[PDB]
Ligand binder design. Structure first.
Ligand SMILES: NC(=O)c1ccc[n+]([C@@H]2O[C@H](COP(=O)([O-])OP(=O)(O)OC[C@H]3O[C@@H](n4cnc5c(N)ncnc54)[C@H](O)[C@@H]3O)[C@@H](O)[C@H]2O)c1
Ligand SMILES: NC(=O)c1ccc[n+]([C@@H]2O[C@H](COP(=O)([O-])OP(=O)(O)OC[C@H]3O[C@@H](n4cnc5c(N)ncnc54)[C@H](O)[C@@H]3O)[C@@H](O)[C@H]2O)c1
Ligand SMILES: NC(=O)c1ccc[n+]([C@@H]2O[C@H](COP(=O)([O-])OP(=O)(O)OC[C@H]3O[C@@H](n4cnc5c(N)ncnc54)[C@H](O)[C@@H]3O)[C@@H](O)[C@H]2O)c1
Ligand SMILES: NC(=O)c1ccc[n+]([C@@H]2O[C@H](COP(=O)([O-])OP(=O)(O)OC[C@H]3O[C@@H](n4cnc5c(N)ncnc54)[C@H](O)[C@@H]3O)[C@@H](O)[C@H]2O)c1
Ligand SMILES: O=C(c1ccc2[nH]ccc2c1)N1CCN(C2c3ccccc3-c3ccccc32)CC1
Ligand SMILES: O=C(c1ccc2[nH]ccc2c1)N1CCN(C2c3ccccc3-c3ccccc32)CC1
Ligand SMILES: O=C(c1ccc2[nH]ccc2c1)N1CCN(C2c3ccccc3-c3ccccc32)CC1
Ligand SMILES: O=C(c1ccc2[nH]ccc2c1)N1CCN(C2c3ccccc3-c3ccccc32)CC1
Lengths: 268, 268, 268, 268
């Protein structure tokens, strides 16, 4: 029963009950899929959040920057799901970029060390995580990551935009690799979703002469979207993810599926 | 059980059991959706082909060039689906181009009358159907067409390629009109499927020359595709359509989904 | 002396002293190129306008819909420039779309006969004109036409948008043909330029509930353009055209060169 | 006489007389522009190569990874060009990637440190230069980088491909900052030019395998290109750059111009 029924899927990126990856896992569980979650430093905290999901799932630690963690993932996962078992899905919902390369800080003022860190976590980790779990996946599986259309320049997104441009390109390579094991790799470009990381800027954390820019940006989205767009509700994005983790899109790979309500296909 | 369980969907484009619509209709029904099929002219002859379907679905006549037909369309679907009842999806699997604008004929040598009719049936009927059927579709329902990625020139496809460009363009506007009803409009860029009216080409009826040209595009498609491409299995495509018909991609319109084995994302 | 010095170029589309093609020809002449202009019905009128250019150029008649005119062009041109002479450039600045398929009239209400007419003149004529003049061009030559980015749907442009989508695709085919004679074919996407055809709507010819839409559309352009954008000045577009007709872009073909001040590369 | 007559332009990226920058510098000078060249480390060794240039142009040292250099850049160009005098254009012909992220090494097998440096030198230095040189450039002046179309995965190019994606993305933002000065920022997607550090590859130093892989991409490029492609003539490219440096494309920024013989616009 369910869309992902019987599939064992790895979800990551969770940190709050408001982050997209949390809703993905919740929908994946509601669709009878069995999970394995990976989290960052505040494991003690992430533990609490996951203790809200409709069902229990082992929670492993995963700093994408720790090449040592990566060297143990496949094993640990093998423990989580059990011998004689393989993964059918891998979801990469991880992003990082110092405020030096996003918010209000000028584009030319982000030092490389900060940018390189963001790209390492936002772009590179997609390839290495795919390098870690590829070997324990069943042919016919789906790896999928989050994206935010970097097609055209926009205010404040600055370097996180460059990282995303570099994520799509990497996604196309991971796919010719993944395709060897019969696995599909795709990205999902979502519109903006009022998550916690931004839940603070909502009141003016970045100020007026900027906190207004991002604002007119989001409104433009529902404005442009033929079917509208509520940014305070991730579900539409999560269902799209689930669709990609299922078996009803087994001919699409190395692609980008836009879950933005058609905004990117309309100018005004 | 079923991905489209309880969805009343219209499928057009069927002529032979080889045609893609037949496989879209098939997978659609194995997943519990109620259908309505439309045929062009040799009506009494396609019943023999839709009689080889899982379930019995009424067949209405629909010649997209005939304005009379279009106008009577909606009333005719009701007479079939049920008073007050609506459609959840409509599939446009209609493509036509005189050999004078496709195959072996030179590009500059196609009369405009032949091109006009190829576009009229290939691009414009998409806006026509949607115009007729929009008023009797459910919110959250969806429309979907068949595409063949024309982002690049290629031998033989010629004016059909230009017809598809317009389709992608026409699709973006249909979504805008479809939004005022909460309906989705998307296209599926299929890979090359050896259909009846296509397997002959390689058979030699195109000549030595062109018969080798076409083979190169195919043989080189499965080569580009990371998870390969079986040119004679419309299932991966039919399954992608059904997916776009479900509620699992509720946030994407005026867009193109590639069920081409990832072959458009690789240069080699 | 000049950029196009010595080149014999064919310019078309002129109708007023405000239309883009007029400014193209003016800049082409200012750059020491010798012209041949083709015009539509009001030849008596177009005559006056051209009698403003910095120099005299024969003015031939050319209805792109008259297959008979097309069958005589190469000859007539041969007369204009003289035996032993060939064309080095061809500029297609021609566009048409009934008000039934552009302005305020809904997208679903444009009948095919009107659309087909627009596409015939906006899309198809590019191929047939290239079919007419290709044979009298010198290898190393450039054919170029006007475009308005049809990448994403927009209000009011409706069917003229579909025609343009179909122009870019045709441009890619004309190029593999043109490439046989060593000729390059490219399109130039310009931002909006307050020409006469729209000089009327400026005051409210289309009304408020629409004449305001197109307005916020144009302002968005200068807003988005990193280098600004004055719509009441064609020159920037004309210089771009000249650049394409010269010999400093002999490796680019079947392309689209955007002369919009970078607006299409910026979201907000 | 000259397309860039009276334009003071900076050209970087020269190491051998084979390198593309040398040909960009050459054609630039034959067209009357005054130049400033920057070299990386074996300085005293490239003077021998820039001494084979039409005219004597000062050479400054510029290691894009060195912050000290960057900071002293602008002051150093003045010491060369003249007090109160400015630059009209800046050419970025800089690309680098450890063999561990390009050629024969597997894709998942490239350490991040090697990728970080390839991006730092391939993508980020573009924003760096522009940041240093922007304050001393003339309005209407322009900046231009070298690109290699990464819209699709391909064998061997691997992480250099991901580095170029970021370049195209970085370029869109540079134009936004460059607009506040009336400067243009564009990239030239060159076709494959057999450079010194590239002709060896086919020579066998890549091995039998990869040495055939690379050949296929090349041999199949001139095949796709409608006006063909001479992989060992950087002139068509150099001439496209100079064009982007002139005032004949004053309305295009944050964009990519393909001097690839039209090879990206054909599927076969
Ligand atoms: N907010 C939007 O509208 C939107 C739209 C499209 C895509 N995305 C992308 O989706 C992803 C997650 O979005 P989110 O909105 O749920 O934000 P989020 O802040 O809630 O989650 C991002 C997560 O990144 C993980 N992370 C950070 N550094 C890490 C590291 N070194 N190692 C391992 N994990 C690390 C954390 O567990 C963190 O909570 C990101 O990649 C993001 O850019 C967001
Ligand atoms: N075969 C492939 O490899 C492939 C690839 C990409 C896209 N497509 C697209 O898929 C769809 C179906 O392709 P197909 O290969 O199965 O071919 P098909 O010939 O079986 O189906 C096209 C159908 O068009 C319908 N049709 C023709 N003229 C019509 C009219 N006036 N009014 C109403 N209907 C009319 C017919 O019933 C016809 O059989 C088309 O839209 C086509 O361009 C096919
Ligand atoms: N206005 C803009 O902002 C803009 C931007 C980009 C591209 N364009 C395109 O540039 C071209 C011309 O633009 P314009 O602004 O100078 O407008 P324009 O109205 O001044 O010129 C278009 C011309 O089309 C020609 N024409 C029409 N029907 C014809 C036919 N049957 N046969 C031969 N010629 C015919 C006429 O001589 C006419 O004046 C069109 O193709 C247009 O869509 C316009
Ligand atoms: N050769 C081709 O076919 C081709 C195709 C498309 C794009 N390109 C691009 O064209 C440009 C030049 O290519 P090329 O083939 O002539 O190779 P090239 O090796 O001759 O030039 C690249 C140059 O990078 C410079 N460089 C390296 N590290 C540096 C540093 N730290 N600081 C400053 N400068 C540094 C050097 O002076 C070096 O010679 C690059 O940006 C490249 O990616 C080349
Ligand atoms: O991808 C993300 C996103 C979400 C959570 C994250 N946690 C760590 C990095 C990170 C990035 N976002 C954030 C929200 N939007 C807004 C936005 C919408 C429209 C236009 C511009 C911007 C914009 C610009 C800067 C920061 C945030 C945003 C973009 C996507
Ligand atoms: O869109 C169609 C298609 C489907 C049904 C049709 N009924 C009338 C015209 C028509 C075209 N096709 C058919 C099969 N392919 C092949 C093909 C694959 C790769 C490269 C070239 C071609 C190609 C060229 C000519 C005719 C058919 C095809 C393209 C999609
Ligand atoms: O390509 C043209 C154009 C110019 C002159 C013409 N003569 C005959 C056809 C024709 C088309 N235009 C006209 C001006 N704009 C405006 C515009 C700008 C931004 C957004 C929407 C629109 C828009 C919509 C409808 C009509 C005109 C326009 C688009 C380009
Ligand atoms: O961008 C570059 C380029 C230029 C200078 C450089 N210095 C250090 C790395 C580097 C890369 N190139 C080099 C030549 N080609 C070839 C090529 C053409 C088609 C397909 C694949 C490849 C390919 C693959 C690996 C190395 C070089 C190349 C790509 C552009």
């Amino acid at each position: 029963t369910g869309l992902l029924d019987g599939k064992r899927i790895l979800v990551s990126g969770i940190i709050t009950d408001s982050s997209i990856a949390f809703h993905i896992a919740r929908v994946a569980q509601e669709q009878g899929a069995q999970l394995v979650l990976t989290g960052f430093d505040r494991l003690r905290l992430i533990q609490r959040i996951t203790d809200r999901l409709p069902a229990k799932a082992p929670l492993l630690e995963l700093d994408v920057q720790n090449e040592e963690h990566l060297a143990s993932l496949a094993g640990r996962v093998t423990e989580a799901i059990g011998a004689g078992n393989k993964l059918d899905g891998v979801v990469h919902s991880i992003g990082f970029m110092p405020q030096t390369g996003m918010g209000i800080n000028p584009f030319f003022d982000a030092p490389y060390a900060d940018v390189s860190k963001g790209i390492h976590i936002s772009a590179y980790s997609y390839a290495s995580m795919a390098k870690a779990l590829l070997p324990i996946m069943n042919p016919g599986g789906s790896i999928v990551g989050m994206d935010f259309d970097p097609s055209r320049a926009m205010p404040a997104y600055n370097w996180m935009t460059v990282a995303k441009s570099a994520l799509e390109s990497v996604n196309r390579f991971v796919a010719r690799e993944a395709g060897k094991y019969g696995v599909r790799s795709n990205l999902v470009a979502a519109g903006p979703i009022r998550t916690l990381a931004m839940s603070a800027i909502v009141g003016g954390a970045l100020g007026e002469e900027a906190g207004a820019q991002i604002q007119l940006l989001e409104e433009g989205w529902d404005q442009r979207a033929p079917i509208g767009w509520n940014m305070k509700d991730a579900t539409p994005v999560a269902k799209t993810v689930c669709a990609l983790l299922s078996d009803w899109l087994p001919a699409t790979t190395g692609d980008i599926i836009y879950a933005d309500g058609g905004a990117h296909t309309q100018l005004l």
